[PDB]
Structures are given as structure tokens and as C-alpha cells.
Design a protein around this ligand. Structure first.
Ligand SMILES: [Mg+2]
Length: 223
């Protein structure tokens, strides 16, 4: 009975470690996320055109609405298995709280917190937290701030005061979020335009846009 007393002491130390991690993640109070809706330029996802929401979903988390914070498939491909690996929920937790570090223990507590926001918030609210708290360069942390700043367009579908964000622009912004900081929307390199091209194929292949919109976007991309 030697191999069971060691398999046990190990199985418990991990469960003990995992238990502590929970308490560390607690909290980390997800109620805090509502503070994002106070931003001067906050626009909720439900008030954005569908291709805009889809520029981000197809690029970052194509099964966004299906999961409960953790995407197994996307996280296996992501496990250094030759567009991952964090779900939009995980990125929301990372951006709001762990604005600083990226350690293994932070990655485990990040999982606990993510589960908690999925529990507390609906998918639309979570998508709104995401789009309103990511870095798009030039000190822009909101999609609308970004859209205004780079293009002078808006992402509020209801808006009538400002021109509407194009398919290309939605794809530039979505591509920028996890692009290397070197990618500069003010002066796009070939690697950047290649990246958005991919974002566009995905939008088309997932039917957030049709062939026509896509071709028009690609065309605009190449001037
Ligand atoms: Mg994941």
C-alpha cells in the first residue's frame, strides 16, 4: 500500500493548492466590472452593428456564446499545439484585474474569476466589458474612442451624428487587440494588413459579412 499513500499525498497537495488558488481569486470582485459602463465613451454591444461584434468574435472567440468561460477546443490548440488561447471572458478578467502580471498562479485564479463573471453576467454584458476595456493603441481603451480617434466613425448603430464604422475598420480594430504592439493602425505594415485579411476571411467564413462586403473591405485594404 505504498503507491496509494504517495498518489494520495500528491493528489491532495494539488487539491490543496487548487483550493488556495480559489481563495486568492476571491476576490478579485467581479461586481467591479460594472465600473466599465461609467466610461465617457461606453457603448454596449447590443448597440453595435453585428459585423462589428463579429469582427471580434471570429478573430478572438468564435464560439463565444457557446462556452461558460473556458473553451476546451480553443485551449487545446492553444496548448503549444503548432488565435488563442484565451476566451473573451478570460481577456476581460485579465484586462480589468491582472493589468500587470502573467504568472502560472495568476492563470489559475483567472480561471476561477472567469467562471464567476459568466455566472454573474450575461454574454452581451461580457462582450460589452471586452469591447470597452481593451487597448487599441494611441491611448484608446474603448472601441468607440478607438473608432472615433483613428477613423472618425462610430460603432453605435443608432447614431445619426457620426459616420458609421465600416467592415474594414471593424476588422482593423479587432485585429489590433492582440496584434504585436508594433502593429500601427496609423501606418499599417504588410504583416498588419495580412493579419486583418485573415480577420476578414473569418468574418466571411462565419457569415458576419457576405461576399460583397468582404471584397469591398479587401479592396479598401489595398490602396
Ligand atoms: Mg480558453
Amino acid at each position: 500500500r505504498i503507491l496509494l499513500k504517495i498518489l494520495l499525498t500528491i493528489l491532495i497537495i494539488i487539491a490543496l493548492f487548487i483550493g488556495i488558488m480559489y481563495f486568492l481569486s476571491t476576490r478579485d470582485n467581479v461586481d467591479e466590472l460594472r465600473k466599465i459602463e461609467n466610461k465617457s465613451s461606453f457603448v454596449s454591444a447590443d448597440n453595435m452593428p453585428e459585423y462589428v461584434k463579429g469582427a471580434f468574435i471570429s478573430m478572438e472567440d468564435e464560439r463565444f456564446y457557446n462556452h461558460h468561460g473556458f473553451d476546451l477546443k480553443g485551449t487545446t490548440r492553444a496548448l503549444f499545439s503548432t488565435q488563442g488561447g484565451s476566451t473573451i471572458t478570460q481577456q476581460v478578467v485579465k484586462n480589468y484585474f491582472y493589468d500587470n502580471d502573467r504568472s502560472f498562479t495568476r492563470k489559475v485564479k483567472e480561471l476561477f474569476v472567469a467562471h464567476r463573471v459568466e455566472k454573474q453576467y450575461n454574454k452581451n454584458e461580457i462582450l460589452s466589458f471586452y469591447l470597452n476595456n481593451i487597448y487599441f493603441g494611441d491611448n484608446q481603451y474603448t472601441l468607440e474612442g478607438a473608432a472615433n480617434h483613428y477613423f472618425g466613425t462610430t460603432v453605435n448603430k443608432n447614431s445619426t451624428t457620426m459616420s458609421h464604422i465600416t467592415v474594414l475598420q471593424s476588422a482593423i480594430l479587432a485585429s489590433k487587440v492582440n496584434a504585436p504592439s508594433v502593429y500601427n493602425i496609423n501606418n499599417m505594415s504588410e504583416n498588419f494588413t495580412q493579419r486583418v485579411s485573415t480577420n476578414l476571411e473569418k468574418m466571411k467564413q462565419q457569415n458576419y459579412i457576405n461576399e460583397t462586403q468582404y471584397q469591398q473591405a479587401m479592396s479598401q485594404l489595398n490602396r
